[PDB]
Write an enzyme that holds these catalytic residues in place. Structure first.
Site, PDB file in Angstrom:
ATOM      1  CB  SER A 125      -0.909   0.476   1.331  1.00 59.43           C
ATOM      2  OG  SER A 125      -2.076  -1.068   0.813  1.00 59.43           O
ATOM      3  CD  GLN A 150      -9.501  -8.651   0.920  1.00 55.85           C
ATOM      4  OE1 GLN A 150      -8.980  -9.265   0.090  1.00 55.85           O
ATOM      5  NE2 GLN A 150     -10.062  -8.807   2.382  1.00 55.85           N
ATOM      6  CE1 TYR A 209      -4.830  -0.244   3.733  1.00 52.98           C
ATOM      7  CE2 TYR A 209      -5.068   2.847   3.325  1.00 52.98           C
ATOM      8  CZ  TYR A 209      -4.735   1.089   3.099  1.00 52.98           C
ATOM      9  OH  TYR A 209      -3.821   0.728   2.699  1.00 52.98           O
ATOM     10  CG  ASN A 255      -6.566  -2.500  -2.087  1.00 52.34           C
ATOM     11  OD1 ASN A 255      -5.706  -1.425  -1.387  1.00 52.34           O
ATOM     12  ND2 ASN A 255      -6.188  -4.115  -1.315  1.00 52.34           N
ATOM     13  CB  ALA A 315       1.528  -5.336   4.069  1.00 44.87           C
ATOM     14  CG  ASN A 347       3.002  -8.194   6.388  1.00 51.03           C
ATOM     15  OD1 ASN A 347       2.656  -6.574   6.976  1.00 51.03           O
ATOM     16  ND2 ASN A 347       1.052  -8.547   6.268  1.00 51.03           N
TER      17      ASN A 347
HETATM   18  O1  LIG Z   1      -0.773  -2.573   1.963  1.00 51.63           O
HETATM   19  B1  LIG Z   1      -1.935  -2.522   1.844  1.00 51.63           B
HETATM   20  O2  LIG Z   1      -2.619  -2.032   3.049  1.00 51.63           O
HETATM   21  C1  LIG Z   1      -3.240  -3.148   1.620  1.00 51.63           C
HETATM   22  C2  LIG Z   1      -4.319  -3.696   1.849  1.00 51.63           C
HETATM   23  C3  LIG Z   1      -4.330  -4.903   1.094  1.00 51.63           C
HETATM   24  C4  LIG Z   1      -6.282  -5.814   1.226  1.00 51.63           C
HETATM   25  C5  LIG Z   1      -6.314  -7.140   0.542  1.00 51.63           C
HETATM   26  C6  LIG Z   1      -5.582  -7.264  -0.447  1.00 51.63           C
HETATM   27  C7  LIG Z   1      -4.013  -5.825  -0.527  1.00 51.63           C
HETATM   28  C8  LIG Z   1      -4.445  -5.070   0.277  1.00 51.63           C
HETATM   29  S1  LIG Z   1      -2.152  -4.168  -0.052  1.00 51.63           S
END
Ligand SMILES: OB(O)c1cc2ccccc2s1
Length: 358
Positions: free
Chosen positions: A61, A117, A147, A149, A315, A340
């Site tokens: 992210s 997601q 928050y 995606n 992550a 992670n």
């Molecule tokens: O690194 B980020 O905060 C992410 C949150 C998610 C949640 C689901 C899939 C992919 C990701 S990247």
């Protein structure tokens, strides 16, 4: 590096690595605007390939900061406005629940509960249209931050529409290249494969899973040297030569919404400096960071505050990343790891280092 930087980094990061069983790590500290680099362990355990200044890590992210800045750049170019309806740039998104949802809402996770997601089943362009057309909001727009995606991912996809460029080509030509991020990729080319670290999850070597909007929400891979340049660029935007990119970086650090002591930018998140370290450490735990929170609009947005802690966690399955910087102090840090591990450990370590040096 100066002894004081070496001292605090070694006393902080080296034990963090042992505590978290991180196979490989690269750190950059930006001090008085100049970068210093630190490496530990292996990019590839089986091949015993060391982490180097050339090693590509998955940013997860932290990619959202590049998406935010790319969006900011499109605003500065007069291509998009954050006040415009989502439907202006996606005319086929006709369903009634989208009336009132603007690009600002998508960029800042305030559309009303777009999900963290996109479901794994959603893959194709038709699948994606169907998903957004069918999505029903948990809240009215501009009331709650969740928050997501599916929120900023869609922002990235629509932000590049007026340019006619693919998301990847806009990012490459408008952000990565002007900033000379020569080893930063959404899609790692064959020539870089030998430098691409493996991530490690449950002891197994892994790379990020493909997904709808991955490029926009979590798909960037970069080296510690390029990430140090990314920090420098965000520390001192008004020193960038390309005028729209300079502005785009500034716009991404504007304060659009407040929840508690944090402010939402485009990708970047910000707090007034000095910060309570417990606030950013505890606040980074996913039980808080992924929870819905009520937002107060900052009306109109506060332009980039130099006296800020500006930061983003990232992550993927096999990687944990963190970037934080304080423009007033010309001070910053990037921490890239191929495991992670929990967010609060990252933030705690970053605070110890930057607070020692400020
Ligand atoms: O690194 B980020 O905060 C992410 C949150 C998610 C949640 C689901 C899939 C992919 C990701 S990247």
């Amino acid at each position: 590096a100066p002894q004081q930087i070496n001292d605090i980094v070694h006393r902080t990061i080296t034990p963090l690595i042992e505590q978290q069983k991180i196979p490989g790590m690269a750190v950059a500290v930006i001090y008085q605007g100049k970068p210093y680099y630190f490496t530990w362990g292996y990019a590839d355990i089986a091949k015993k390939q060391p982490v180097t200044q050339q090693t590509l890590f998955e940013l997860g992210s932290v990619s959202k900061t590049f998406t935010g800045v790319l969006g900011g750049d499109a605003i500065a170019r007069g291509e998009i406005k954050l006040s415009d309806p989502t439907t202006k740039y996606w005319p086929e998104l006709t369903a009634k629940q989208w009336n009132g949802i603007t690009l600002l809402h998508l960029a800042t996770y305030t559309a009303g509960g777009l999900p963290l997601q996109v479901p794994d089943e959603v893959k194709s362009s038709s699948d994606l249209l169907r998903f957004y057309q069918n999505w029903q909001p948990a809240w009215a727009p501009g009331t709650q931050r969740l928050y997501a995606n599916s929120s900023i991912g869609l922002f990235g996809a629509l932000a590049v529409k007026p340019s006619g460029l693919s998301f990847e080509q806009a990012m490459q030509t408008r952000v990565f290249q002007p900033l000379k991020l020569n080893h930063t990729w959404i899609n790692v080319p064959p020539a870089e494969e030998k430098n691409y670290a493996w991530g490690y999850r449950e002891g197994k070597a892994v790379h990020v899973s493909p997904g709808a909007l991955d490029a926009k929400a979590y798909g960037v891979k970069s080296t510690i040297e390029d990430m140090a340049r990314w920090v420098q660029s965000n520390l001192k935007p008004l020193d960038i030569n390309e005028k729209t990119l300079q502005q785009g970086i500034q716009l991404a650090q504007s304060r659009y919404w407040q929840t508690g002591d944090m402010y939402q930018g485009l990708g970047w998140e910000m707090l007034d400096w000095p910060v309570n370290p417990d606030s950013i450490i505890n606040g980074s735990d996913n039980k808080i960071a992924l929870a819905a929170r009520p937002v107060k609009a900052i009306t109109p947005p506060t332009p980039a505050v130099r006296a800020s802690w500006v930061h983003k966690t990232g992550a993927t399955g096999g990687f944990g990343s963190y970037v934080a910087f304080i423009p007033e102090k010309e001070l910053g840090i990037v921490m890239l790891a191929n495991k992670n591990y929990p967010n609060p450990a990252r933030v705690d370590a970053a605070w110890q280092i930057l607070n020692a040096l400020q």
